[PDB]
Design a protein around this ligand. Structure first.
Ligand SMILES: O=C(O)[C@H]1[C@H]2C[C@H]2CN1C(=O)Cc1ccsc1
Length: 133
């Protein structure tokens, strides 16, 4: 029942500062422009201890499956090869990505009927709001 309130299909309804977040992470111009237009569907499911998070969009489809606290390999939508660990901290899913001596954290939170995604790289934060599809 660990992530019951996250489970479901969610659609992006608003974004703030995502272009700047992508710049901070290292994404190049053309990818930022195409990726920034996307309105992904985020689909979260749980089977036993395995959580799956899919992102589906016209830009790229991604899927990750993981156990909380157990590191895994991820290829991000912008083609970074990262080492990721996702934990639950006070009801927030905290996703840390490490690569090339850098780090970024993506937090996913249930707030009212929304799922709020906050992405941070050094001083740069982006907030992405999702609603039920
Ligand atoms: O899933 C989302 O809303 C946002 C936010 C969680 C981060 C990554 N993300 C994406 O969309 C995927 C992406 C696009 C270009 S680089 C990476």
């Amino acid at each position: 029942h660990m992530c019951d309130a996250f489970v479901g299909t969610w659609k992006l309804v608003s974004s703030e500062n995502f272009d700047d977040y992508m710049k901070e992470v290292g994404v190049g111009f053309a990818t930022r422009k195409v990726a920034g237009m996307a309105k992904p569907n985020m689909i979260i499911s749980v089977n036993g201890d395995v959580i799956t998070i899919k992102s589906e969009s016209t830009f790229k489809n991604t899927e990750i499956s993981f156990i909380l606290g157990q590191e895994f390999d991820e290829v991000t939508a912008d083609d970074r090869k990262v080492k990721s660990t996702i934990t639950l901290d006070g009801g927030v899913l905290v996703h840390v990505q490490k690569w090339d001596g850098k780090s970024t954290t993506i937090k996913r939170k249930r707030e009212d009927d929304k799922l709020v995604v906050e992405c941070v790289m050094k001083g740069v934060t982006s907030t992405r709001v999702y609603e039920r599809a």
